[PDB]
Amino acid sequence: SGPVPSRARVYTDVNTHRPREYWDYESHVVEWGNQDDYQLVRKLGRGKYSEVFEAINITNNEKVVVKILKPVKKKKIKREIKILENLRGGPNIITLADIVKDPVSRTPALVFEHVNNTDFKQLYQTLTDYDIRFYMYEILKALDYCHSMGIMHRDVKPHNVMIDHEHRKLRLIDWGLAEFYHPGQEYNVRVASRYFKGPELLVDYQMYDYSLDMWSLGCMLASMIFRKEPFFHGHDNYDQLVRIAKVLGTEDLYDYIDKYNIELDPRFNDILGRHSRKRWERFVHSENQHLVSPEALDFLDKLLRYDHQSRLTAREAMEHPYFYTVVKDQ
Numbered sequence: 001s002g003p004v005p006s007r008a009r010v011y012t013d014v015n016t017h018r019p020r021e022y023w024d025y026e027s028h029v030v031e032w033g034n035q036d037d038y039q040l041v042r043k044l045g046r047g048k049y050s051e052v053f054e055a056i057n058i059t060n061n062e063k064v065v066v067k068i069l070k071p072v073k074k075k076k077i078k079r080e081i082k083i084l085e086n087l088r089g090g091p092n093i094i095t096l097a098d099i100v101k102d103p104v105s106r107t108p109a110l111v112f113e114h115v116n117n118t119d120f121k122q123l124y125q126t127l128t129d130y131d132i133r134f135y136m137y138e139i140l141k142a143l144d145y146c147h148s149m150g151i152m153h154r155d156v157k158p159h160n161v162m163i164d165h166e167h168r169k170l171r172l173i174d175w176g177l178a179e180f181y182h183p184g185q186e187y188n189v190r191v192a193s194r195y196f197k198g199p200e201l202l203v204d205y206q207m208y209d210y211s212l213d214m215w216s217l218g219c220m221l222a223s224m225i226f227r228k229e230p231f232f233h234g235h236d237n238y239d240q241l242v243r244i245a246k247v248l249g250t251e252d253l254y255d256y257i258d259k260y261n262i263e264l265d266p267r268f269n270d271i272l273g274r275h276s277r278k279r280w281e282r283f284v285h286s287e288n289q290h291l292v293s294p295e296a297l298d299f300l301d302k303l304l305r306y307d308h309q310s311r312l313t314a315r316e317a318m319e320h321p322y323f324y325t326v327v328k329d330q
């Protein structure tokens, strides 16, 4: 017996009650649209697994985004497609409009609703206190939805939260790393993006859950209210934990690993050190003070916990006083 097991505290058993087909994405049969409906306009980016384009649907003259897939593990294709279909129409979830075969790649191309996004680096510099609260609530709607549907996003970060600021519209995108939560399942820790990786990933604890997304959201919040993007700025995955420990303290880190009977990579022996837990006020200064309130700090504090079991759930987060000032729809 190595690690102590763990379970999500909410939506724990949602998938087990489902028909197999809901989560057994390996058996999913892709429904294909017509590639000729779409004309590529310009490349937006390239990752290790895909290329993303702005495009036009020539049938309706509507802008769309086309992601042409190329993953090495090809079962990930069906996983992303099944998750997108399962979640389609949920609050603030990007809509998959079509799936077509690209004639050049001969691979699936996912067609999504367009978002006229403001670049996050520019945008975060302009967010007011009210805006941060507003958009955080919007992200929480999306996360509580997918969690309630038995799905963890696993790549929450600024790029994946597409905001059209002009129209105050938000969409959670790129479900390519998302997975179905099953109690007792051990998951790959090589997920999320460095600055947003939860302590569970960084200590190699595999039996994690929806609460991973809440750590990532906390990292986003900290970057927004303190105007420090990213907040925990590691050079690699090991330094990433050290950066966290310099804020949350090493004593609570050891309490966490001790709770789950986890051992740190011996790598940490001569780099981790001994750090006190810092008060959040440490990160406040004249340039970010207009974004900080006791409610902001308390909310942040309750997201950024080493113990994934201790973090606020998305629904609990929506109950927080931080959101009292936000006008709800509609």
Ligand SMILES: O=C(O)c1cc2c(ccc3ccc4oc(C(=O)O)cc4c32)o1
Pocket (backbone or CB within 6 Å): 044, 045, 052, 065, 067, 094, 112, 113, 114, 115, 116, 117, 162, 173, 174, 175
């Ligand atoms: O990778 C995906 O799945 C993905 C990317 C996007 C998406 C859905 C809508 C989008 C809308 C605007 C964008 O601007 C960029 C940009 O990079 O500037 C990317 C995107 C994406 O899905």
